[PDB]
Amino acid sequence: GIYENNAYLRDGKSNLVSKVVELHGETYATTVKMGLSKTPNTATSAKVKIDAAYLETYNKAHNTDFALYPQDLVTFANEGILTVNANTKSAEVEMTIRAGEGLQEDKTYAIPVAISDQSSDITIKDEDAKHCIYLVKDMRNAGDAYKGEGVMQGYLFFEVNDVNPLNTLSFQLENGKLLWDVVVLFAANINYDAEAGRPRVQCNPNVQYLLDNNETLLQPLRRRGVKVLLGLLGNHDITGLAQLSEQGAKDFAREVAQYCKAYNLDGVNYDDEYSNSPDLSNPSLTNPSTAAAARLCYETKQAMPDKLVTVFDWGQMYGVATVDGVDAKEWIDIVVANYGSAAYPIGQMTKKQCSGISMEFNLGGGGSLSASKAQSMIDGGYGWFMGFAPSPAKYGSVFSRLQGGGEVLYGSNVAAPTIFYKKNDPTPYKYPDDL
């Protein structure tokens, strides 16, 4: 034990082994950090390099298809030599990712990085400790939702039974930026398929209409930089998001990832409400537990590592910080809390993954995104503000609750709306004249 100095690699800014990078400009800078379980010795040393062979391994493990990011666009300071810091049991090297021309739009590329030429005192337990990975997306042309580096971001649920998610586009700052970085199609369901003997994704006709018509009703949001997530919600049977066995969660996560791939979406929100007691004799199910919920989140992220796995902190959906030795910061990207409270991190997550406010736009609770509230949330280190169930019919109240906060968060207040959309209709109508 005393001589085992185990090394692993991670992104130095995020501390994640698998890090999604959005390129909003020409250059993106970070560090690659090698963590050590013991204090280094005098001669301790290592380098990093891009390891293209590992991408084959990674894609097989995740059932993914990521192409390799062009290596010439990736530069390590010092030909990749890690600067060892004895006092912090770590070593790091700067990495710059330059944006390139000729890449395919809306495609995720990978930069697999390996420890190389490590000194004899370092142990690397397996190929997964030996590597970290960056999953790179070029967002340079899809900047309208990008309001700056490190600003607070918006997370919006649409009740798609009633409201068209193109209404995302009704919300702009006076400088033209789109307010809502992430939107959720609330919601597809988990339900029992008696014939298959297991849970399945079940979409009501309103959810299905959006998916079938995603090119006209969802993809326009994504073209302007908004992440569109599929909401998943329990639905009054023996199945639920916090009561799947390991195998049940693996199978369900596979289906969720299939949806997100087929319809070109950006991830999922899980909300554990409305399920009934499970049939414990069914191998796909288990006792309801936050542990089962965590298992599902972990398996979902494994199936779609470049997409967002997010949770509503309600029911038994959130609270277990590790699955199979992997900490929650790797598999919960965003957590939003109930109206009137701020979310909190678990494991090695930070408040940057958490909502500082949740506003129920239909029912009224949760407060307002005022100048004062904006500053309170910034002071608290929160990453997100959440809204639920906006509707054009209630834009007066909705937008009233958004006054003042934009100038603090972004240097530009939210503008009064001039456009709205009707359910299942791509037509931009004039607000308020066409209501």
Domain ranges of the chain: 1-143, 144-435
Residues in the chain: 435
Cα→Cα distances 110→135, 277, 360, 403, Å: 5, 42, 38, 40
d(CA 309, CA 228): 12
Q: Could you give the angle at which helices 290-303 and 246-262 cross, rounded to 10 degrees?
A: 40
The residues annotated as belonging to the active site are 273
315 is in an annotated binding site: yes
Per the structure block, which two tokens stand in for 206? 């309103």
Helices (H) and strands (E) counted in the chain, each on its own, are 10, 24
- Last residue before each gap in the chain (C to N over 2.5 A): none
> Strand, coil or helix: what is 175?
coil
d(CA 366, CA 340): 4
d(CA 130, CA 108): 22
Question: Which residue from 287, 296, 284 is spatially nearest to 198, judged by alpha carbons?
Answer: 284
* Domain 1-143, classified CATH 2.60.40.1740, yes or no: yes
d(CA 98, CA 75): 8
The method of structure determination was: X-ray
Residue type, 316: Q
Q: DSSP letters along 350-411, please?
A: -GGGBEEEEEETTT--S----HHHHHHHHHHT--EEEEE---GGGHHHHHHTTTTHHHHHHS
Q: DSSP letters along 224-246, please?
A: TT-EEEEEEE--SSS--TT-B-H
d(CA 67, CA 306): 12
d(CA 32, CA 134): 10
Determine whether 29 is exposed, middle or buried from the number of CB atoms within 10 Å of its CB (0-12, 13-18, 19+). Answer: exposed
d(CA 360, CA 382): 19
> Strand, coil or helix: what is 206?
helix
Q: DSSP letters along 47-97, please?
A: EEEE-HHHHHHHHHHHT--PEEPPGGGEEEGGGGB-EEEGGGTEEEEEEEE
Judge whether 1-143 and 144-435 match in fold: no
Q: How many CA atoms lie within 13 A of 407 on its CB side?
A: 5
Nearest 5°: the CA angle 377, 380, 381 is 90
Beta carbons within 8 Å of 274's beta carbon, 6+ residues apart: 233, 234, 235, 236
Question: Which residue from 139, 132, 136, 86 is spatially nearest to 112, judged by alpha carbons?
Answer: 132
Beta carbons within 8 Å of 233's beta carbon, 6+ residues apart: 186, 187, 188, 189, 190, 241, 271, 273, 274
d(CA 199, CA 159): 23
Beta carbons within 8 Å of 291's beta carbon, 6+ residues apart: 320
Resolution in A: 1.5
Residue type, 26: E
174 and 433 Cβ atoms separated by less than 8 Å: no
Q: Which fold has domain 144-435?
A: TIM Barrel (3.20.20)
d(CA 401, CA 360): 10
What residues form DSSP beta bridges with 327? Answer: 322
Question: Which residue from 230, 235, 226, 170 is spatially nearest to 199, judged by alpha carbons?
Answer: 235
Per the structure block, which two tokens stand in for 158? 């649409």
12 is in an annotated binding site: no
Q: DSSP letters along 286-326, please?
A: -S--HHHHHHHHHHHHHH-TTSEEEEE--TTSS---EETTE
